[PDB]
Symmetry: D2
Subunit: 259 residues, 4 copies
Amino acid sequence: HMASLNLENKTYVIMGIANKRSIAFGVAKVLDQLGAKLVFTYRKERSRKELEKLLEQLNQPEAHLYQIDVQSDEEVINGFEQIGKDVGNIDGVYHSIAFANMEDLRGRFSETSREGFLLAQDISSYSLTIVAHEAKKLMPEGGSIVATTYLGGEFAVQNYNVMGVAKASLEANVKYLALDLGPDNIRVNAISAGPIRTLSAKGVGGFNTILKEIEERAPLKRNVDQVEVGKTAAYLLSDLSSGVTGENIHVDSGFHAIK
Amino acid sequence: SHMASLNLENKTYVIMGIANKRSIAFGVAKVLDQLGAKLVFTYRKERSRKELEKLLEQLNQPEAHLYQIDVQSDEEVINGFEQIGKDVGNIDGVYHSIAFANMEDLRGRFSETSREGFLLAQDISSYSLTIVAHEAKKLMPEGGSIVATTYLGGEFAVQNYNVMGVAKASLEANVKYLALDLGPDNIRVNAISAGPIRTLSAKGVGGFNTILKEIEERAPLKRNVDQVEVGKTAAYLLSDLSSGVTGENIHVDSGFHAIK
Amino acid sequence: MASLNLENKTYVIMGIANKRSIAFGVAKVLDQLGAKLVFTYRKERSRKELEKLLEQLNQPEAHLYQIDVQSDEEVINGFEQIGKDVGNIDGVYHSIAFANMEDLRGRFSETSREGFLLAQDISSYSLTIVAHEAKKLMPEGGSIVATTYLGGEFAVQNYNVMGVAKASLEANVKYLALDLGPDNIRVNAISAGPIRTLSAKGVGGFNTILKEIEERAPLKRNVDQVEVGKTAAYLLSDLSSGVTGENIHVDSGFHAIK
Amino acid sequence: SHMASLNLENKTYVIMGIANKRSIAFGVAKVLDQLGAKLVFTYRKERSRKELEKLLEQLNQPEAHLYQIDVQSDEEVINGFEQIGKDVGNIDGVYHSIAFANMEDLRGRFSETSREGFLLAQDISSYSLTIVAHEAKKLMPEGGSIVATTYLGGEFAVQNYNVMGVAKASLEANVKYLALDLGPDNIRVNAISAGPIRTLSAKGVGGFNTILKEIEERAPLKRNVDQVEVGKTAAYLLSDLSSGVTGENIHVDSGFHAIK
Ligand SMILES: NC(=O)C1=CN([C@@H]2O[C@H](COP(=O)(O)OP(=O)(O)OC[C@H]3O[C@@H](n4cnc5c(N)ncnc54)[C@H](OP(=O)(O)O)[C@@H]3O)[C@@H](O)[C@H]2O)C=CC1
Ligand SMILES: NC(=O)C1=CN([C@@H]2O[C@H](COP(=O)(O)OP(=O)(O)OC[C@H]3O[C@@H](n4cnc5c(N)ncnc54)[C@H](OP(=O)(O)O)[C@@H]3O)[C@@H](O)[C@H]2O)C=CC1
Ligand SMILES: NC(=O)C1=CN([C@@H]2O[C@H](COP(=O)(O)OP(=O)(O)OC[C@H]3O[C@@H](n4cnc5c(N)ncnc54)[C@H](OP(=O)(O)O)[C@@H]3O)[C@@H](O)[C@H]2O)C=CC1
Ligand SMILES: NC(=O)C1=CN([C@@H]2O[C@H](COP(=O)(O)OP(=O)(O)OC[C@H]3O[C@@H](n4cnc5c(N)ncnc54)[C@H](OP(=O)(O)O)[C@@H]3O)[C@@H](O)[C@H]2O)C=CC1
Ligand SMILES: C=C(CC/C=C/C=C/C[C@H](C)CC(=O)C[C@@H](O)CNC(=O)[C@H](C)[C@@H](C)OC(N)=O)C[C@@H](C)C/C(C)=C/C(=O)O
Ligand SMILES: C=C(CC/C=C/C=C/C[C@H](C)CC(=O)C[C@@H](O)CNC(=O)[C@H](C)[C@@H](C)OC(N)=O)C[C@@H](C)C/C(C)=C/C(=O)O
Ligand SMILES: C=C(CC/C=C/C=C/C[C@H](C)CC(=O)C[C@@H](O)CNC(=O)[C@H](C)[C@@H](C)OC(N)=O)C[C@@H](C)C/C(C)=C/C(=O)O
Ligand SMILES: C=C(CC/C=C/C=C/C[C@H](C)CC(=O)C[C@@H](O)CNC(=O)[C@H](C)[C@@H](C)OC(N)=O)C[C@@H](C)C/C(C)=C/C(=O)O
């Protein structure tokens, strides 16, 4: 049609809020301000308590929360079947889910366990494939799926180890989904976020060193936050990004472009 | 109070490279207009000025500000931007939609390309962005956003693109080096890689209809794109929606870049 | 001194199954350059074929070891045993991949969790564990090479789950290169163009892809197992010193065009 | 009888861009010499001819064939290659090790770059390969291999590379478009992306010792590369060992391209 960022009459599933620092919460704040109906997903019960507390910050009249552990085909198939009944058809999904064992992230990459490797692949990459298959059922008119990645999918970064191979997998997942679901007018894209202080990120060594290197070396000489990812998520989830699919947008102050 | 906003009132954007209603830059203009931006326009030929004045009737621009700039001339570019600074004041960004090569060099085997045809393509299609950026910077002391238009032929050897492929590769590196230079001045530099669109430049190149049909057949979205889709992405990149994005190349091409 | 004389060099070659195997192309080439070759196989059908094929080579002593890369034990034990039988090695050529035909025909979005993680296990993780063990036999340094396809870099029709496995493999190579670089171990990939092999025979319209290469690729021709072998020789020898984390396309220039 | 062979007897290679003993192209020459190849050399300045004659004593080249070619001149390039065709006959490939930009443009902020400095860098550092390829093709009716030398700054914005980064991006696209054009004539075109090396061109740029130290600290192999390592990879790419490889860019840089 034309260029509009008015997301009234739009419904978006947002997977992977855990606390106020979660990137997916940044996405939620932004989509909320633009007047979208938001469905939320969580794994742990601690995340449900946090979500209910955080909905007070939003202008969401009715809370729709669904527990989905992406490790379970059943929790994913049932979760999306249930969303279809409770809220009906949706316009897109924001995927903000990743995990690896701290054991495998400290080790030399060559020491990585078969279990730690396939675990990282399962949660951080395959989750997008099954989520896409199910969400498709609620998007007969078309829609937009967005996953969150890191530069470590494209380059060997110190300490990212097994998560780098998971993100490389995720980034190829996005391309293959984009080619598969394109004929159904479903767009699939990734956001490569710069480093952000979150629940997942807190408790890895010298994370403050990486934040300082970005401020020093990145073109914009600053770090990014959850809302900047949110703004780009709005572009990719809305029809502003029509004709964009299989794309990876770096929201990282230009760090990807330098060496 | 809105964090994420596409409200471009109180924003001024220079748009270089409108020639007719089919121009990609016109798609950009229609979109930025609808979002309530003040638009300055640039043209080379007089045919383009006549067309621009006729087309402003389609827009909600109260005052027409047109400036003749041939990007081959340091003086026309330096003077044009000095004049825009006086007439409209400080700007928030520039959309660059300018390219040219001799049809001679685009038909030939790439190895037959003339030194003159090669350096001409570089001058208009790549260096133009460097000098435009240097001058526009003077009108963006608070920061801003520069966007150039490229094609997948900058990244891969495509049949018949020849000398323009090497110009676009040059443009795409230009964007990265400008992004690194002007980043500390809070100026973002990015490119849009547009899929094929029927325009004045594109009409009269061989079997262009073959390329449009291959996109519809092989590209993920099984369809071609238009000037407005480029316009929408231009709005994202020129607005503060794209804050934290610089040195980036967004493919608006129905996913064609992602497949093989 | 620039030399392709591989006397006094020993190379493990994983993934020979028949005479059409890419790894066999690698073996023929390394043999002609006078290298001692250790071989690995999974199925017994592959052992029978290997013994028959060693007659075509100038290998005095046959060293065959059964390793299924799905098993930590078969991989750890296989490489411990190679260390005893032949001693220290100079590199490993990895030519191993697998996915369920089920998942390769389906729309990629239909892919099963089992089919996906299986492809990752054999086609990508195998390189990580192989590298960990082979390192033990390369205290002076060495070269590891894995085989990939352009489908790791771009979505190609019908490659589906194997594309995501190859994307994983190609990142594996980069992360191994960064980890084992300080131990003077180089890790690189060869992106082979399409070749008629046992694995490749019986997948839909493979003859369409071979014809598109001959028509559209810069060299207007397909490649064979030996061309991969020649590039494998470069990457496994010290000719490629200073090259690590690299992906060489042996594909008639197809990767460079669109 | 050897499928895989690095025996370059009965092979003739033109090597453009030796200036002194530290030149990358000299590393290429030493390696190709040891493998028993007939080597033709090219130079611009007379200082380079004196140095070349002195350096031929280090090689096992029976007959010295030196030709002055300034790649800025179509005539010097067309005539030089016509003359090589008469003196030595048909060749098997060309190693291109030629680049230049004004020190003025390499110190400045990239946005300050002059139109003259930009197009000069493009002319010598990129177009030179196109015209050299067109002429050398005439001496390679059976096929052959052309190799150009590039730097990571063609792919990423690196501090201080400025206008040479845009030239190398141009060169790297040149290689792809030449590979597609000359492939049917069985001519392969590839690039080597060398890590940083102490040479005549490189000496006298600021904090070059900082970049060498960052490579030793951060690159996978925790060491820098030299002219011979580039030479070894040049041997692979120029010989038939690299058959089926064209439009490729091999990083000889201790793995630095693969990390971030
Ligand atoms: N923070 C950063 O610097 C960057 C992050 N990213 C990516 O952004 C995404 C989110 O990161 P961030 O916001 O830091 O992470 P958070 O720690 O805030 O959120 C992680 C989320 O993952 C969810 N999760 C983990 N396992 C599962 C599972 N099996 N099923 C469902 N949900 C699960 C968690 O839910 P619960 O805790 O309830 O399981 C949690 O909500 C990730 O994909 C990450 O790779 C990318 C670049 C940078
Ligand atoms: N159409 C397509 O399929 C694609 C186009 N592109 C790129 O999009 C951009 C514009 O193309 P498109 O809109 O189709 O073409 P148009 O024919 O609509 O526009 C070309 C424009 O370039 C201007 N121009 C040319 N030379 C100069 C100069 N020396 N100084 C100032 N202006 C000049 C022309 O002005 P005048 O008429 O006054 O000379 C004209 O307005 C180019 O960068 C092109 O490479 C990228 C991908 C696809
Ligand atoms: N053929 C082609 O066109 C191309 C192939 N490639 C890649 O080249 C490599 C070799 O394939 P190619 O030579 O065609 O196929 P082959 O049929 O020759 O080989 C498949 C090989 O993988 C081995 N293998 C499979 N599973 C396991 C396992 N669990 N443990 C150990 N070995 C295993 C097989 O052994 P067994 O059968 O005895 O189990 C067999 O040797 C693959 O990585 C492939 O993706 C890349 C580009 C093109
Ligand atoms: N050194 C490094 O750190 C790296 C260098 N490279 C590349 O390697 C190549 C050579 O580098 P390096 O060893 O440093 O170079 P050298 O300084 O040793 O040689 C530079 C050469 O360029 C030649 N040249 C310049 N202009 C012309 C012209 N108009 N016509 C003919 N020849 C000309 C010079 O000839 P004369 O002096 O006779 O004018 C000289 O032979 C370049 O392409 C460079 O970009 C790539 C990565 C790293
Ligand atoms: C180079 C780095 C620093 C090392 C970072 C490793 C992070 C990897 C990704 C995941 C998110 C970390 C992870 O698996 C967390 C757990 O091991 C421990 N924490 C938890 O379990 C908490 C309770 C939950 C909520 O976490 C999850 N995921 O469930 C990368 C950084 C520069 C950038 C970065 C941090 C990228 C990224 O997140 O992918
Ligand atoms: C692979 C292709 C197909 C071949 C098309 C090559 C087009 C290259 C673009 C240049 C800019 C065309 C060009 O310079 C045309 C002029 O020589 C003649 N036309 C004019 O002068 C008219 C009057 C004016 C208005 O035109 C200009 N430019 O001033 C590429 C296509 C599939 C995609 C494409 C068309 C890309 C692109 O535009 O860059
Ligand atoms: C686009 C294509 C065409 C579709 C090709 C799919 C091939 C994927 C490769 C995997 C490895 C094939 C595979 O796993 C098939 C098995 O399910 C059954 N085959 C076997 O079991 C045979 C007997 C054994 C030897 O197989 C194995 N692996 O053990 C890709 C092509 C253009 C290029 C190509 C064929 C690339 C590649 O091999 O990866
Ligand atoms: C990131 C960097 C540091 C910035 C320096 C870049 C230098 C690039 C080389 C260019 C070609 C310098 C140049 O144009 C030379 C002249 O301006 C001055 N020198 C000469 O005139 C001598 C006498 C002659 C023989 O040289 C020439 N061109 O003829 C780059 C480094 C990390 C790596 C590097 C320097 C790469 C490279 O060579 O491109």
